[PDB]
């Protein structure tokens, strides 16, 4: 069956190699005859599958690499907790979080950057932050710098431990194949073990530490004399004072009359007006139910005993009439090629990151989070960016799998075979859908702008003119606002407040959430999003499906994954490798994310965020001009892009001045990218040649023969600089604007 088989001490911890670069690649280890060697060295370091031919060694290598990654993550967490401990105003922030700006970074007074340590309130000076740690540290009842300090220490310990574990598992006790390739027990554990018990232990930490101290702070007390956590579990009488049921030990649970615990485990829903956040009772019930669900899920597959399924015994049964034999053998494909798994997991992880970004703003989990505007905004846009990048990586590695490790002779399948057998139909129909959406979602904006600039407003696309109504969205919102009436009696309000029914939650003269109406502008922006997503999918899916062989080049696969072209023959064959398909799709994903985040910023600052008067009149941060100025590109310039770019541009000579400076460098690089994206190579090669002559004239010609970057590396550096410029520009814009006005 399945056992603990491993091997002993393959590679010794000897520095013999560190002084010899490129030991892994036979060609690289010979020596740098030119300068392209030092590019090619970094370029293929992590390329494990091109260093061997057996999956055992590359599996060991990736097992060690995961430990390296985890060590870096732990070190980052430790740095964060430290800087919170020794360099923040966290205690003053806890004193009253309504109007005290979270700052967690000071700068040394050397070169005039003292102005960076701007006024943040609470007798502190420091660069304001928007990471949003403080809402978490108030949720977990840290409420003391000693806790941050010791947590940073423990994080450092875990980091060193993981680094050790890595070194040991690669060098000394290397796992074997029948361990890795055994996915049944891995699924079994990770379902039951990691996620379930994780959520369970967190529910523990919440019901036994957070809930009481948070309730006390909501009652209003200086956290100095707030009783320490362990003094809430050792002596029961405190929790007894809080929750009568909680003073009944464990009888009401075991004896199946769970309703007694109804006080601290409940299903209220909505938000908590004391902090706008979620009712921690609800989130505790959530984490606990999720723990139980993962535990009961974990027991699916047979591992050693006689019960349970087998991932081979599940696929082959499914075989429909149209497709034929079904998923037979697919189990072998997804167990014999790492790149396949990397692609699948990257896709699912990007999608989950996006849905996390979405669910965050509309249901603020933490307390006093939906009122620190910049934090909410920055979190949402960061998660969106991460999701986009993960998705593109998924597509790229899927293409790499399609090229290298796919083969019908032994890694056969009858499903993917059919899929590839009609690729042309797929790409054609997706292309036509892309054209259709492009037309009927952007030409609408063009028509609206034109009919505006021609003095014919009553022929526009808006509520006051020829009208388009997003009826399905309002239908769903009505349903979600009337569902807690009959369908979900156990709830108290709608699942969130953004559903089109209820009241508004406002703390400290500022609003946090309220109903959200949808106008024709929302219809148009949603169709823009749909179109751009469809085009990115078109690019990447075409790349994957045509990575093997196209009707232009018959044997593309033999030429490898990443090569620049196939010469200028047959009318020119530039950018045919799947690698170049990903190079293209990157820009379109960037554009999709950019327009999405702009739409989000405008919609929030024009319909939700803002301040509330003493009487109750709302005056939003931007005045609520969305439904009347999002329908013209010229509007986007005037109402949003130009106007709300003030705070970044007057930012010189103030605390926010750093956000100003980047706003130029971001643009600059942004420029710079074109120089690599537009030019070619031969020109630069000849220029380098003349420069080498000019040097050689002075007996300075270096033996590391200069060489203009190879084509693929040129495109890579170009796209990297371009993404950097764009993202840094929107980053500076967002931070400066929101943290200045809000």
């Amino acid at each position: 069956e399945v056992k603990i088989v491993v091997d002993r001490d393959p590679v010794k911890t000897s520095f013999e190699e560190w002084a010899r670069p490129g030991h892994f690649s036979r060609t690289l280890a010979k020596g740098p005859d030119t300068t392209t060697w030092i590019w090619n060295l970094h370029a293929d370091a992590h390329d494990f599958d091109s260093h061997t031919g057996d999956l055992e060694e590359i599996s060991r290598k990736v097992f060690s690499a995961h430990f390296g990654q985890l060590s870096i993550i732990f070190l980052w967490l430790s740095g964060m907790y430290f800087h919170g401990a020794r360099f923040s105003n966290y205690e003053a922030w806890l004193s009253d979080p309504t109007h005290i700006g979270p700052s967690a970074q000071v700068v040394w007074p050397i070169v005039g950057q003292e102005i960076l340590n701007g006024d943040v309130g609470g007798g502190f000076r420091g660069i304001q932050i928007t990471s949003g740690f403080f809402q978490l540290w108030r949720a977990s009842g840290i409420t003391s710098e000693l806790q941050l300090y010791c947590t940073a220490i423990g994080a450092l310990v875990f980091a060193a431990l993981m680094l050790f574990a890595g070194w040991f598992h690669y060098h000394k006790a290397a796992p074997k194949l029948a361990w890795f390739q055994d996915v049944e027990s891995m699924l079994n554990h990770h379902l039951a073990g990691l996620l379930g018990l994780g959520s369970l232990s967190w529910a523990g930490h919440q019901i036994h530490v957070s809930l009481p101290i948070n309730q006390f702070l909501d009652a209003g007390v200086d956290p100095k004399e707030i009783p320490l956590p362990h003094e809430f579990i050792l002596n029961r009488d405190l929790l007894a004072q809080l929750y009568p049921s909680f003073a009944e030990g464990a009888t009401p649970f075991f004896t199946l009359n769970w309703s007694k615990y109804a006080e601290f485990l409940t299903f209220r829903g909505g938000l908590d007006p004391v902090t706008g956040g979620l009712w921690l009772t609800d989130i505790a019930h959530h984490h606990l139910a999720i723990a139980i669900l993962f535990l009961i899920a974990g027991h699916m597959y047979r591992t050693n005993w006689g019960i349970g399924h087998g991932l081979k015994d599940i696929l082959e049964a499914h075989k429909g009439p149209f497709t034929g034999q079904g998923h037979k053998g697919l189990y072998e494909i997804l167990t014999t090629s790492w790149h396949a798994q990397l692609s699948l997991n990257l896709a699912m992880l990007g999608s989950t990151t996006i849905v996390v970004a979405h669910h965050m703003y509309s249901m603020p989990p933490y307390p006093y989070l939906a009122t620190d505007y910049g934090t909410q905004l920055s979190l949402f846009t960061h998660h969106m960016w991460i999701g986009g990048f993960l998705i593109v990586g998924a597509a790229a590695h899927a293409a790499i799998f399609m090229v290298r490790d796919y083969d019908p002779t032994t890694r056969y399948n009858d499903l993917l075979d059919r899929v590839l057998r009609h690729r042309d139909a797929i790409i054609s129909h997706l292309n036509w859908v892309c054209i259709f959406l492009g037309f009927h979602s952007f030409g609408l904006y063009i028509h609206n702008d034109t009919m505006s600039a021609l003095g014919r407003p009553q022929d526009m696309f808006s509520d006051t003119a020829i009208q388009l109504q997003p009826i399905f969205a309002q239908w769903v919102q009505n349903i979600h606002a009337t569902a807690p009436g009959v369908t979900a009696p156990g709830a108290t309000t709608s699942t969130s407040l953004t559903w089109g029914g209820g009241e508004l939650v406002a703390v400290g003269g500022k609003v946090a959430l309220l109903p959200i109406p949808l106008g024709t502008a929302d219809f148009l922006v949603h169709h823009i999003h749909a179109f751009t997503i469809h085009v990115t999918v078109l690019i990447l899916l075409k790349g994957v499906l045509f990575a093997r062989s196209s009707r232009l080049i018959p044997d593309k696969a033999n030429l490898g994954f990443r090569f620049p072209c196939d010469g200028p023959g047959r009318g020119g064959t530039c950018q045919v490798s799947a690698w170049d398909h990903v190079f293209l799709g990157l820009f379109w994903m960037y554009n999709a994310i950019s327009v999405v985040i702009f739409h989000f910023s405008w919609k929030m600052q024009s319909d939700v965020w803002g301040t509330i008067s003493d009487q109750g009149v709302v005056t939003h941060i931007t005045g609520g001009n969305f439904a009347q100025s999002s329908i013209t590109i010229n509007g986007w310039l005037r109402d949003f892009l130009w106007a709300q770019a003030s705070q970044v541009i007057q930012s010189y000579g103030s605390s926010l001045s750093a956000y100003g400076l980047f706003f130029l460098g971001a643009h600059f690089v942004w420029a710079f990218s074109l120089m690599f994206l537009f030019s070619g190579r031969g020109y630069w090669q000849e220029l380098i040649e003349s420069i080498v002559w000019a040097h050689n004239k002075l007996k300075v010609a270096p033996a590391t023969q200069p060489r203009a970057l190879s084509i693929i590396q040129g495109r890579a550096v170009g796209v990297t600089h371009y993404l950097l410029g764009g993202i840094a520009t929107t980053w500076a814009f967002f931070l400066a604007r929101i943290i200045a006005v809000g």
């Binding site: 006790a173 050792l234 030990g249 464990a250 009888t251």
Partner: protein
């Protein structure tokens, strides 16, 4: 081999090498396809021996003081449950002939000396009887197997007279008493975590009143 809840991965390596193999291992840990460091069957027998011995000593000692206090002449100055002796600060403490912490690190250093030397012997058997040790050198060679050291330092009276059968009896006795002491220790500690009054007083209770049956209450308290 009195089979109590065995399996086949047990019998893959539990072929009767440990003194008195009963055949009880559903999981099948030490399967010898790849010998896991510290999962070696030799190491497993070593571990059961060492653990059971420590548990015997602990079950005697933790219970000794208060128990003796009952109708004995060890003063009530130490009439305290083992889990209230001071090892569990949320229970009790005591003023000793030093402070708590330095005492702990000192005893840790001593036990570390002993067990480090024992482990070094484990790796290289007999190899302690070479280096200068201010005497004691001509004793620590052991009886070959680190499992069973022997030696007049650890064989004073003299048993297993001319025999391996007598050693087999004495030794079965060892495994049985180790497992029994393990059970008794674990039970005392669980009562302590759930009852809260102390083992010997629990006997004081369960001598007369049968109705106790505190699994019925399942009351979880400090």
């Amino acid at each position: 081999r009195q089979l109590w809840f065995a399996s086949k991965q047990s019998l893959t390596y539990l072929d009767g090498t440990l003194p008195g193999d009963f055949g009880f291992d559903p999981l099948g840990l030490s399967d010898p396809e790849g010998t896991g460091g510290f999962i070696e069957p030799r190491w497993l027998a070593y571990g059961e021996i060492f653990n059971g011995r420590t548990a015997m000593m602990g079950v005697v000692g933790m219970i000794a003081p208060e128990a003796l206090g009952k109708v004995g002449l060890v003063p009530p100055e130490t009439a305290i449950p083992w889990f209230q002796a001071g090892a569990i600060p949320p229970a009790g403490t005591y003023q000793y002939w030093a402070d708590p912490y330095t005492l702990f690190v000192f005893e840790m250093a001593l036990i570390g000396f002993a067990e480090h030397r024992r482990l070094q012997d484990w790796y290289n058997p007999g190899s302690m009887g070479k280096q200068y040790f201010l005497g004691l050198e001509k004793y620590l060679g052991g009886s070959g197997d680190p499992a069973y050291p022997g030696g007049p330092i650890f064989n004073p009276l003299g048993f297993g007279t001319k025999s391996e059968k007598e050693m087999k009896e004495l030794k079965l006795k060892e495994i049985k008493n180790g497992r029994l002491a393990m059970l008794a220790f674990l039970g005392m500690s669980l009562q302590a975590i759930f009852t809260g009054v102390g083992p010997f007083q629990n006997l004081l209770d369960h001598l007369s009143d049968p109705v106790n049956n505190n699994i019925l209450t399942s009351l979880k308290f400090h």
